[PDB]
Design a protein around this ligand. Structure first.
Ligand SMILES: Cc1ncc(COP(=O)(O)O)c(/C=N/[C@@H](CO)C(=O)O)c1O
Ligand SMILES: Cc1ncc(COP(=O)(O)O)c(/C=N/[C@@H](CO)C(=O)O)c1O
Ligand SMILES: O=P(O)(O)OCCNS(=O)(=O)c1ccc(OC(F)(F)F)cc1
Ligand SMILES: O=P(O)(O)OCCNS(=O)(=O)c1ccc(OC(F)(F)F)cc1
Ligand SMILES: [Cl-]
Ligand SMILES: [Cl-]
Ligand SMILES: [Cl-]
Ligand SMILES: [Cl-]
Ligand SMILES: [Cl-]
Ligand SMILES: [Cl-]
Ligand SMILES: [Cl-]
Ligand SMILES: [Cl-]
Ligand SMILES: [Cl-]
Ligand SMILES: [Cl-]
Ligand SMILES: [Cl-]
Ligand SMILES: [Cl-]
Ligand SMILES: [Cl-]
Ligand SMILES: [Cl-]
Ligand SMILES: [Cl-]
Ligand SMILES: [Cl-]
Ligand SMILES: [Cl-]
Ligand SMILES: [Cl-]
Ligand SMILES: [Cl-]
Ligand SMILES: [Cl-]
Ligand SMILES: [Cl-]
Ligand SMILES: [Cl-]
Ligand SMILES: [Cs+]
Ligand SMILES: [Cs+]
Ligand SMILES: [Cs+]
Ligand SMILES: [Cs+]
Lengths: 264, 395, 395, 264
């Protein structure tokens, strides 16, 4: 939790928004994933959103579906993901680390024990993609007990009861959903941003379909705290599977361009 | 906030992305309103009688119980239009879609029976229907796929992951995630997020209501037990529902034991899985130690689903209903037995229920018992599967 | 000497070898006695309701008549156990065999629907059943052959002559020629020697009796016409019988036109054949100029029979019923139309009747008319045939 | 008709019964059939029973079914049969010739015209296999108008009404059926013979399963006028299709043996 509050305070002092990429842990392999993640940080990433591979990711479009299967093709397991997460934290003390989870992986060995393991390896937040605010009570309670920010989705079809709910219950950042549907860069909000600030919500990050520098600058201009980009990054991985070195160079140039767009 | 309790004890819930919660709330409110609307009920009753053919017969099977003190009736959902009980509740959900002003239908199917049911209901009621089906299932169910397309439906194979039921389940929810303003998701069993377990039960409960009236007319008393196979739980809960408060009536659900529970190749999560959260619900699941959803297995495609409806998990937990399993070989022997001695070809799914009734009879042949088996479908779709096994076996 | 008139006008009779006349006289007397026996009628009614599923629905087809002044109902014999109207009269004949003290059943079948019906009735009633089927038909009807054997029946391919229906008809009579003391010949249509045209009509007349009661309930009046396909004539005469004295009700039988009457490749002897004597009866036949029985043709195996029941020839001659033909292509278009707009997959046999009703509607769309089509069976058995044509055609 | 009365009167004067073979006309070909028929007569046949090939012979077992199909394989038609019949009569003035017909071939161009054609070529009798006495009126009337004996079947399951019917209506000979079933030598009556004589029936010939000299002597001993043998003859044809000359020699030896058995 603490790392998001420190990041957003620094970004505002630097008159910058946050750029936050998403990747699947272990896509396309453990060793290459760790190099991917270090490149994203070194290229300008302000925080990370990291997926644990799951058998049935019903909130992901085809780009991240294939990322999960690539990770499964490498034999990646949740336990290997949490060893990666510890190593990532040991290398990067200030970078906020958020997890994108599916409910069964959090519930499998006990919800409280999941969040305790998150605290032990230094994760900062957890978004559970198939837990709506209506079902969130045991997840957010376990999260807070272990100093983990529970991340809530503010959809575009939200009403004022939902806005007050996400504002009260969330920490770290509010995930400002761009649109209906699933994750993807094939399918490309100021009103919600003001009410969220009115209700003292966690700072807002827009996600779902951010693929271009113009969209990052748009999120900052709308008064959001930053923008999240998952499929655009994963697509670069998917394009360059045969050339690991080119993959990192293409990742570096995209992240650098997206982070540059967050100054204004 | 909901109008109805989303849980049966600790099982059930609404475990979907936030973006889909308004769709489930809309559907719950439309269902609650429709259940108070005599006009809706009359239209549903009209379709069930004059289009689907209800009431279905209750057949007394004399030959197969000869020499025992078991009396066995079969509730003949095999005679329903479409060939299985699936037709009942798609007619109700199709009317619910129209009540909401929706014009498109999304459906998932593994065996093809629910997809055929969804396609026929949509053809009749003028809804544009699209059906997701694991690519593996498309390949093995070419007849049902051709039936769906003859009825004007779009059949979409799902190459995601395992390319089976659960991935078809996933792509259906993925689609509905963006189209719910014009499309209704027509879930095929008594599972998934609230309100579907409740809706599917209420739109299948004529099975048990008719059975009760028919057995009282023929026998003057309630059955000692009613027996039904359990995939997701829709034909079983449809048979059970009207008997739940008749506490002398046993409620027996039969899960597929596949090659044997000990082999791990089965479809029996209620008794041999572990509670998890998937497909919008908290329910017993087939899952790895790490919490990945496992693949189930059964000779019958309609039972090959790695979870179970939450009302069944609840009825089990409080002891109101008992659940058992039946292997492939037991189901095959029940299939042959009904063909030869009653002239009825049962679905391999329903053959699991029949097999357990035959076990109850044969194990204790001087026990006086009045049993009803839910005969959830006909087995024309299964004769190629049975033929290949029988002659690969030698007989 | 007989109890009942063996002829309908000049058509019909008992043209069998002398050795078989005592068998036909026995059967006539048993039938006459059974029709006066309330115990027999109650047992038949019990099997029809609780085993076969009667009454069958009468379905109003709104979508296919939109924009015209035709109201079209379908009498849903496709929902009967077994999937066609054939089941009705085999239950009655199986009870007649038992009344006579017979323990074995002989049956003939071309498409396999009557053979499956005979096998299921014999399995239920404990009769040993043997079924003759032209070897050509055995090869093209592997599903129905496997159904018959699952139900314990012996299926015997007939390599005689053409190795089709008529030769199966021949070997059945050949067998019965020596076994009639213990075996009953369960003829599958309203044809052959007296008393079969009479028995089959009376054991199918619930089709028309139910239709009359149902249309009066729903519409307050009798239909303007009832329409049925005609192979041997059993579903048509079952639909017609209760309306024969309602002289305002048109009776329309539809013969298969095959590739076109002008091609000679058809199954329409009533309107385009010549009276002859064969299969125990005097009736219109497909025959060569020299009096050899010709081969008929139709896309639908159930209509591919080179003669017709004598009551149809008689009703035609006096003008009480009108007979028409429908080609393969017309029947296929009716099949597709019902699938897509009503969600019902009809037998290709029944599709001939539907096609003619659709013609009556489309030719005169502002004519007010209330029509019932006898939907004699479901078309699951036909989807492979339709699939192969559709894609060999391009669509 | 007249030829049967003259034959039976001569046979009784010679203290002999009749032996009457059946063959299918045109089996295995027209030329060979004519030689077959001449051999049967020359070998001792007292009369002939001759089948016209029909598409659907429902009273025939497999041996004669195959005879019909062999004849069809040669293209034999009813018109070609009646040309054969005229040639047979021109060669054999006294031999009684009976036809085995199916009803549709008699009815096809008019029942009366069929029997007129029978008279013109010199046929003596007609048995219509699928016309019971109950349906026989137009056939027997046309037969008698054209001097053709109508041949009626006396089955083993006959009653006294049937016996009086066949005795009154028949001419030429009464066909004394051996058994139920269809024609055949694979499946092998004095009471009926006496009542038939009591009712002044045409003289009785037993048929259906006669294949051995002992059965001919048995029919004579039972007071029948003779015996008819069809499948045993047709089987000899079927055995020897590849050697026409052997076929005739085997036919001659069988007919000679069967006729010898009719003296006693
Ligand atoms: C004839 C029959 N009996 C039982 C079941 C089992 O389903 P419940 O437990 O009754 O909901 C099925 C299911 N079929 C699904 C699964 O693939 C489907 O068609 O897509 C079925 O087709
Ligand atoms: C579904 C259906 N409709 C109509 C008919 C036509 O028969 P009728 O005219 O009603 O007697 C048939 C016949 N089937 C026969 C022929 O092979 C048989 O099964 O052996 C049929 O199966
Ligand atoms: O750029 P895109 O379109 O690929 O979006 C990024 C996706 N990665 S993520 O971890 O932030 C993410 C966030 C929310 C998700 O589902 C939910 F909204 F229901 F919770 C799924 C993935
Ligand atoms: O020796 P078999 O067993 O072959 O019998 C000879 C058969 N040839 S036949 O022309 O006399 C003959 C006689 C009667 C027939 O049927 C009927 F009895 F119903 F009329 C059929 C053939
Ligand atoms: Cl950085
Ligand atoms: Cl922490
Ligand atoms: Cl922390
Ligand atoms: Cl907050
Ligand atoms: Cl509530
Ligand atoms: Cl709870
Ligand atoms: Cl209600
Ligand atoms: Cl197919
Ligand atoms: Cl009822
Ligand atoms: Cl009672
Ligand atoms: Cl035991
Ligand atoms: Cl009479
Ligand atoms: Cl007459
Ligand atoms: Cl009656
Ligand atoms: Cl098969
Ligand atoms: Cl009724
Ligand atoms: Cl009315
Ligand atoms: Cl027109
Ligand atoms: Cl001589
Ligand atoms: Cl003459
Ligand atoms: Cl003469
Ligand atoms: Cl006389
Ligand atoms: Cs019993
Ligand atoms: Cs299951
Ligand atoms: Cs209309
Ligand atoms: Cs016909």
């Amino acid at each position: 939790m603490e790392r998001y509050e420190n990041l957003f305070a620094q970004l505002n002092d630097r008159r910058e928004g946050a750029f936050v990429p998403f990747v699947t842990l272990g896509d396309p392999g453990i060793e290459q994933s760790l190099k991917i993640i270090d490149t994203l940080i070194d290229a300008g990433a302000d925080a990370l959103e990291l997926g644990v591979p799951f058998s049935d990711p019903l909130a992901d479009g085809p780009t991240i579906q294939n990322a999960n299967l690539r990770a499964f093709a490498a034999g990646v397991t949740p336990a290997q993901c949490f060893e990666m997460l510890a190593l990532i934290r040991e290398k990067h003390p200030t970078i906020p680390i958020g997890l994108l989870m599916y409910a069964n992986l959090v519930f499998n060995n006990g919800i409280d024990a999941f969040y305790a393991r998150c605290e032990q390896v230094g994760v900062d937040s957890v978004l559970v993609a198939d837990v709506p605010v209506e079902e969130s009570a045991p997840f957010r309670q376990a999260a807070l007990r272990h100093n983990i920010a529970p991340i809530f989705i503010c959809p575009p079809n939200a009403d004022d009861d939902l806005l007050r709910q996400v504002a009260s219950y969330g920490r770290g950042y509010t995930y400002l959903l761009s649109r209906s549907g699933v994750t993807g860069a094939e399918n490309r909000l100021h009103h919600l941003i003001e009410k969220l600030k009115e209700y003292h919500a966690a700072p807002a990050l827009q996600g779902f379909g951010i693929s271009s520098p113009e969209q990052v600058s748009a999120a900052v201009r709308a008064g959001a705290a930053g923008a999240i980009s998952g499929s655009a990054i994963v697509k670069i991985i998917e394009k360059n599977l045969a050339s690991p070195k080119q993959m990192l160079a293409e990742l570096r140039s995209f992240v650098s361009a997206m982070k540059a767009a967050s100054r204004a | 906030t909901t109008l109805l309790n989303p849980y049966f004890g600790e099982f059930g819930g609404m475990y979907v992305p936030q973006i889909l919660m308004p769709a489930l709330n809309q559907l719950e409110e439309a269902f609650v309103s429709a259940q108070k609307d005599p006009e809706f009920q009359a239209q549903f009753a009209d379709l069930l009688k004059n289009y689907a053919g209800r009431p279905t017969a209750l057949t007394k099977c004399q030959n197969i119980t000869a020499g025992t003190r078991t009396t066995l009736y079969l509730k003949r959902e095999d005679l329903l239009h479409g060939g299985a009980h699936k037709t009942n509740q798609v007619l109700g959900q199709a009317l619910l879609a129209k009540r909401m002003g929706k014009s498109e239908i999304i459906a998932e199917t593994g065996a093809g029976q629910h997809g055929v049911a969804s396609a026929l209901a949509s053809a009749l009621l003028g809804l544009k229907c699209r059906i997701y089906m694991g690519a593996k299932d498309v390949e093995r169910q070419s007849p049902n796929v051709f039936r769906m397309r003859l009825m004007g439906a779009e059949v979409i194979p799902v190459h995601s992951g395992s390319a089976t039921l659960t991935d078809a389940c996933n792509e259906a929810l993925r689609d509905w995630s963006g189209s719910y303003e014009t499309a209704h998701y027509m879930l095929g069993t008594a599972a998934g997020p609230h309100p579907y377990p409740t809706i599917v039960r209420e739109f299948q409960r004529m099975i048990g209501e008719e059975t009760k009236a028919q057995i009282l007319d023929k026998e003057g008393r309630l059955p000692d037990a009613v027996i039904a196979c359990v995939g997701g739980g829709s034909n079983a809960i449809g048979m059970f529902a009207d008997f739940i408060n008749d506490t002398s009536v046993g409620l027996i659900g039969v899960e597929p034991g596949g090659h044997g529970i000990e082999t791990g190749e089965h479809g029996a999560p209620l008794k041999h899985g572990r509670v998890g959260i998937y497909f919008g619900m908290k329910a017993p699941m087939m899952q790895t130690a790490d919490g990945q959803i496992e693949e189930s297995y059964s000779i019958s495609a309609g039972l090959d689903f790695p979870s179970v409806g939450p009302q069944h998990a609840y009825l089990n937990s409080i002891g109101r209903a008992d659940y058992v399993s039946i292997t492939d070989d037991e189901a095959l022997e029940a299939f042959k037995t009904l063909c030869r001695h009653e002239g009825i070809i049962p679905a391999l799914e329903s053959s699991h229920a029949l097999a357990h009734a035959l076990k109850m009879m044969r194990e204790q042949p001087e026990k006086e018992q009045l049993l009803v088996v839910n005969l959830s479908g006909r087995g024309d779709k299964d004769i190629f599967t049975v033929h290949d096994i029988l002659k690969a076996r030698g007989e």
